[PDB]
From a paper:
Mpro is a three-domain (domains I to III) cysteine protease involved in most maturation cleavage events within the precursor polyprotein. Active Mpro is a homodimer containing two protomers. The CoV Mpro features a non-canonical Cys-His dyad located in the cleft between domains I and II. The first ORF (ORF 1a/b), about two-third of genome length, directly translates two polyproteins: pp1a and pp1ab, because there is an a-1 frameshift between ORF1a and ORF1b. These polyproteins are processed by a main protease (Mpro), also known as the 3C-like protease (3CLpro), and one or two papain-like proteases (PLPs), into 16 non-structural proteins (nsps).
Numbering used by the authors:
A (entry chain A), B (entry chain A): 1 to 303
Write the structure that this text describes.
Amino acid sequence: SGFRKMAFPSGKVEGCMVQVTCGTTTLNGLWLDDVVYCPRHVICTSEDMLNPNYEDLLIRKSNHNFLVQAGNVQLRVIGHSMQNCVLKLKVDTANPKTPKYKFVRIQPGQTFSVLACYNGSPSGVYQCAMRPNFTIKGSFLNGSCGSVGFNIDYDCVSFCYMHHMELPTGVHAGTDLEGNFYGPFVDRQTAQAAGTDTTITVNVLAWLYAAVINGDRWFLNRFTTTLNDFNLVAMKYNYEPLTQDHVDILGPLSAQTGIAVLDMCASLKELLQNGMNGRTILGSALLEDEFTPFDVVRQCSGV
Amino acid sequence: SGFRKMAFPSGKVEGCMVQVTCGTTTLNGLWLDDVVYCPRHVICTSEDMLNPNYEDLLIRKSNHNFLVQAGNVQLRVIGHSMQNCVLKLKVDTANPKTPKYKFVRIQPGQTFSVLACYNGSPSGVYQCAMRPNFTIKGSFLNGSCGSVGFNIDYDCVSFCYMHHMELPTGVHAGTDLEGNFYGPFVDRQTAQAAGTDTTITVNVLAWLYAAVINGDRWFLNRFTTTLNDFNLVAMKYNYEPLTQDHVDILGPLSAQTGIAVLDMCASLKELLQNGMNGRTILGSALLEDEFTPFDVVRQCSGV
Ligand SMILES: *C(=O)[C@H](C[C@@H]1CCNC1=O)NC(=O)[C@H](CC1CCCCC1)NC(=O)c1cc2ccccc2[nH]1
Ligand SMILES: *C(=O)[C@H](C[C@@H]1CCNC1=O)NC(=O)[C@H](CC1CCCCC1)NC(=O)c1cc2ccccc2[nH]1
């Protein structure tokens, strides 16, 4: 029993983290085979953060301008190139700790683990969701750029996020490992800001199922609703619409608990219209939306 | 910016996890140098869980009754002994991945990271506090026994918890790595249950400071209180008393924010008597008590 925000074990990613320095800027890089991946804004000086032309900035660089350090061993850079908003630094040594890996872009509402790093040294690991507005609510200080987000399946690491910047509201923006930003954000200085966000409905329903599996039942009721009537309520409370595919994805949890999805939707409707009346669910006084149905199944396998 | 429940990177502990089987019972062990540590209840059969005599059960065992597997390599057991509620299985190979380590017993109100494991394979990592009643609110299924809790300081792992059992309320109980239980719990079948718990006041104040550092200020006020008047309120709301040592420990966070500790105590008094009036702090609608002052400083270093 119990239900925690749980990250994947981070050792396979720890063995990939390095430090990259260009000029006076230090951030992290990801070393896989003989390539180190990092944010291209490592090459930007304070004097040209408004409208950097990265193609020009990079043409003016040589391999020796990039200092890469893996633990206390310097890696020699033997090529450099840009891939969208990431740099690829070819080094003369393949990482002996390279795990099986993939580069996968995730969807809003999906979750992943972040290994926060500074100076190429891992500091902490935590779980995050990609919000509907393509930001993440992370925990990142100066120096954390190049830290990555990932999921692990069997022994394969699927990297899905590299950190680039913090927006004015304190949420975070970055790219996939092909260097393409999540959301309408750019690696230059603007007034860019997080757009309106919404709550991830299917995840809230998954977490209510987690709660039932863990013995929290007070929010259940004898009612059911139709999908259309539920989505009218969802729209009123800034929740994403629930689709039949979402209902299908919740099938296993519904079977395990014996509570039909539209029955649980009636509970969620009542929680949105009435609140919790001083009670808690899985130790929270808010409806939690950063657990996917797969996260719940993985963690609450057989109660 | 941002504030997350963050665990320590788990790779140094991943390299220590093994599987231990005795009879039909499989759980996890911790392999350090040439010793594997695991819960002694691995030797208990279903027929003697009410009043096992572990001294007798172990005298009837031989080394070959213990099957230890590290990845897909079997380790040969060459000695066995009991240390309080842990078994020590001497094996014929020193773990080449042994980190620098210590065995440290923690205090209630202290936090640590748990590497949940099954069949000697790490599954997830999360942060936990030792409650005042010496339970932990973990996430553990069948097979998780022998999973450990730890903190990391520089490159030294301080192991502080090994998992043994779940209580009837769904919270968890275990030992330090010397095999001594946290709290009034035993590794035999009884009606034992978690005793009354309380909220960790100094941790709530630390988290309010984290919130201020992260831009949540709505709960601040112009008032201050005395320590005695605050502790009268604490007692009414089942909070631990706040000591002058706690005030001293909060010194750095108070200096960084410019908010005196007894000024923040006045805010906490108002939150306990009035509630939050529909607002949130660091994404929570409850007062959070599983971050220590050190956790806050480590994560919110320089905003
Ligand atoms: C890389 O390590 C950091 C990570 C920041 C630091 C604080 N918290 C984080 O996540 N990235 C930055 O500091 C970027 C660097 C820019 C260089 C030029 C191209 C764009 C990225 N800057 C910011 O994250 C930043 C600047 C800024 C100014 C005003 C409001 C918000 C804001 N965010
Ligand atoms: C080891 O892997 C497990 C971990 C449990 C499983 C479910 N969640 C956990 O944390 N440990 C157990 O199953 C113990 C084994 C006992 C063997 C004999 C000596 C004491 C431990 N049992 C329990 O955790 C347990 C049994 C039980 C019965 C009734 C109410 C609660 C309860 N808890």
